[PDB]
Amino acid sequence: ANQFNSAIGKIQDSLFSTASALGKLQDVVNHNAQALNTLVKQLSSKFG
Amino acid sequence: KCVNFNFNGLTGTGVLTKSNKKFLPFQQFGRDIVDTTDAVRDPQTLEI
Ligand SMILES: *[C@@H]1O[C@H](CO)[C@@H](O[C@@H]2O[C@H](CO)[C@@H](O)[C@H](O)[C@H]2NC(C)=O)[C@H](O)[C@H]1NC(C)=O
Q1: Which of A16, B15, B27, B45 is the most buried (most CB within 10 A)?
Q2: Pairwise CA distance, residues B31 & A11, whole Å
């Protein structure tokens, strides 16, 4: 029980300090926002 | 009110509201990061 409690306490630090993962959800959000922004920005192109 | 506005040759359709943006004196209009027009200076009363 003590070992599990220590690990679950360290969880709140290992999730936001060591980084590694948790960047994939941010990657999804960034990719969708960037695609939408590019789609809007394509309206300013002359295309010849 | 949603109107078709023509400000000094810049033509569009939208609703106009009073702005807290502070244009530089030479600036006539402004646009977003995606280059969509967002604020227009009125050439008569110099209001944004
Ligand atoms: C455009 O013309 C008007 C005069 O027709 C200029 O001055 C305005 O005059 C009215 C007269 O009732 C005043 O109430 C406004 O306050 C005046 N406007 C300003 C901005 O001072 C007006 O300035 C002219 N626009 C210009 C020169 O850009």
Answers
A1: B27
A2: 44
Task: Give CA–CA dist B14/B34, Å, rounded.
Answer: 17
A13/chain B closest Cα distance in angstroms: 35
Resolution (A): 2.9
Closest CA to B36 of B15, B12, B4: B12
Q: Which residues contact B32 (CB under 8 A, 6 or more apart)?
A: B38
Provide the CA A40 distance to its chain's centre, in angstroms.
Answer: 22
Chain A residues near residue B33 by CB distance under 8 angstroms: 37
Contact B20, B30 (CB under 8 A): no
DSSP string, chain A: -HHHHHHHHHHHHHTTTS-SSSHHHHHHHHHHHHHHHHHHHGGG----
> Obtained via which technique?
cryo-EM
